[PDB]
Symmetry: C3
Subunit: 307 residues, 3 copies
């Protein structure tokens, strides 16, 4: 029952929810910190349209002038893409201040889940989830995303956890906190730019339909928390393992040596891997995002059907 001075849902999205059309949420960190200009905004508007061509309704989420806004104008997206790193990356602990100081912010997966759940949106597409960082056994550097997944009822379609992270530790972590890690048509956990990895999802499902069904069962039996749907990047756009892993490993060593830490790590690694791959990691990431948007449209349609 939040006040409009706090949360503002755009009329497209409101109508969508009234008329029970399927809605897919999207995040703003990917635009501001995830990718450079103008690939971030092109990518974002285009993801929105992809969703539209699948017959669903996009709601991109962000903090515009201190307001939590569900659905955004082309203008505001252009805005986040131009202002870029100057915009505040917003996780859970960041949110109330960016709302109070009335500033603009780009929501992470955590925040995007929070707001989406506030708006009653169950399906959310992104590129890759945050997770347990390499070295975390000694650094305790662990995304708030995982705790959000533990606690907030949103399904997040992604290409897995970002492959710059520690995937093994991430899979243990998700199990401890009772979060389903669903492979869409895959048992092997997808690694972001790359289609497989040495690890496993917690369950393989071959259709949106079964995922929607699981969601309804899960929530109706009271098990609160979200679900991760790991969606492999299409073969056309997949980075070959050896190259990408070399660029990731170098970028991670460099970040260690340079004392990069905290909320700045992921943007640093993503950009540096893009430098190291000459733009290829970035192209692949954009491809992965469109793909997840498509699957996410199918899942939301299937979920709305049941609900």
């Amino acid at each position: 029952k939040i006040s409009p001075e706090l949360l503002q849902i755009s009329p497209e999205v409101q109508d969508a929810l009234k008329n029970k059309k399927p809605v897919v949420a999207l995040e703003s960190t990917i635009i501001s910190h995830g990718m450079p200009f103008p690939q971030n905004a092109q990518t974002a508007i285009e993801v929105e349209e992809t969703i539209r061509k699948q017959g669903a309704v996009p709601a991109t989420i962000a903090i515009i002038g201190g307001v939590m806004k569900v659905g955004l104008s082309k203008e505001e997206i252009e805005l986040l893409g131009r202002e870029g790193h100057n915009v505040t990356k917003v996780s859970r602990r960041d949110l109330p201040f960016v709302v109070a100081a009335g500033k603009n912010g780009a929501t992470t997966v955590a925040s995007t889940m929070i707001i989406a759940a506030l708006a009653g949106i169950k399906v959310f597409a992104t590129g890759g989830i945050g997770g347990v960082h390499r070295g975390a056994e000694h650094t305790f550097d662990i995304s708030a995303d995982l705790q959000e997944l533990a606690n907030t009822n949103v399904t997040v379609v992604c290409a897995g956890a970002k492959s710059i992270l520690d995937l093994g530790l991430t899979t243990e972590y998700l199990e401890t906190f009772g979060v389903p890690l669903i492979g869409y048509q895959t048992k092997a956990l997808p690694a972001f730019f790359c289609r497989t990895s040495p690890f496993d999802v917690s369950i393989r499902l071959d259709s949106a339909s079964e995922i929607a069904r699981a969601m309804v069962v899960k929530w109706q039996s009271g098990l609160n928390g979200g679900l991760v749907v790991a969606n492999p990047i299409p073969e056309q756009f997949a980075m070959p393992e050896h190259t990408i892993n070399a660029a990731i490993d170098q970028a991670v060593a460099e970040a260690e040596a340079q004392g990069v830490i905290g909320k700045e790590s992921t943007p640093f690694l993503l950009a540096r891997v893009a430098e190291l791959t000459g733009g290829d990691s970035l192209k692949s990431n954009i491809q992965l995002v469109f793909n997840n948007a498509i699957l996410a449209s199918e899942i939301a349609k299937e979920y709305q059907r049941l609900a």
Copy 2:
């Protein structure tokens, strides 16, 4: 509070006991499928139900049958889980929605069991031993979802402590961090599962059922959610020799690690291997501790229905 009959079904017996305020004791399915071999699996489970019956209390064995969460089971069902063994999905919280959605059978761990018991409003649950922090968890992050269920869900779990195959010190630390009281029953020293003693202490030591119940009531009436571990030492008669059992466990652990056994397979492999190495003795101790735990859990049950 009202869960659909398609998802959740309580036996008529357990329903009359709940209705008529008879003290009910919950029981887990995974003990049967993944914790013991056949016929000992089904045999022990039925003899446990009987044991709780002698105490003048009503057992509800919990499992997933044909996609339904089932509180209370028939002899046929217990037996089916028993003979089906590893063919039955081991079910933790992350697992739960998919077994139920897909109409399958599943054997519930402490976590799943607690979840379901809590749905039927059963506060007392007897098992052999709880999951915990695995040896090597500093680097592996392998930490049972049981401990998280304990953190949030209102059930008392009577056991011989954590399975001796785990890392007990880190478990005690973990429970403190998460606000879960670890109650030694008539001991300040943490019971070791197969062993009565460990070089680790419980958080509170209490000598009667009634105290345990009254502490339950203050805890919940006060709004601190989460369960309680009541660690009940195996009786002196059936205990394992420190030397022999420890050697068995250590070999088993080194072996599991060397073979690369990970995830939900770890515990069932280690129990099997330990039973093998001890020429079945460990198993016999396990059974005996389960009966003991059941008796104590019935007493706490009566004392709880009282207040």
Copy 3:
């Protein structure tokens, strides 16, 4: 029910919408030696009263969760000392069940304040990730209470005996805002500064209060850490205080100190190695935090 009692001076302010600031009893029983423990408690209360707000010291007396306390009960906690049960969240129901007395930690003080509707609470410094928690898993339940329960905790940062870096990672993970008051760098407790930074620098109590109402109205449960730099003149010498802390921790490890008794031991050991100066620094930072806390509580009461 009868399992929580609120002093009439406290309820009087709650009903009448006046600023209330919580305090913890572990500062007293296990935090500081007698007589300075009771003295510090009473004078902290006074500092609040004079600040324009109403002190409520939470503790468990005769099994009761008590909001606001008599000087008799304060002297009792200060004197009976380490003989009083230290109470965290796991501890709580039993100390109540058994009608015993206990000194509440930041965790339990947050709980109790929450039961009574007190959104603002002042302490010296919170528990956190201990040095070597990476191998020991030794992590205060406080961090979890901050993750979950809605209370603002004003302090000197985390007690500097702990592992602060790990503590900041952990706070991020669990979504708990770490607010530096007029500082980017995380207050180091005895020290005014640390190699670590907070999550946001806020310069005024009002800002913090608006952040509070916006945070909870939005439904994000969990508390807030407000880190208050120790006054410049009371700060310990970095070399002396860190040499002390380091030795004390090395000893604690050697001697098999663990669990709930780890922090009290180290504190006692540190003031001993610093010949009372760290305790003196400690008492000052507590007063300072009580002042900032009063301001926050007032500015927040104004706003909703």
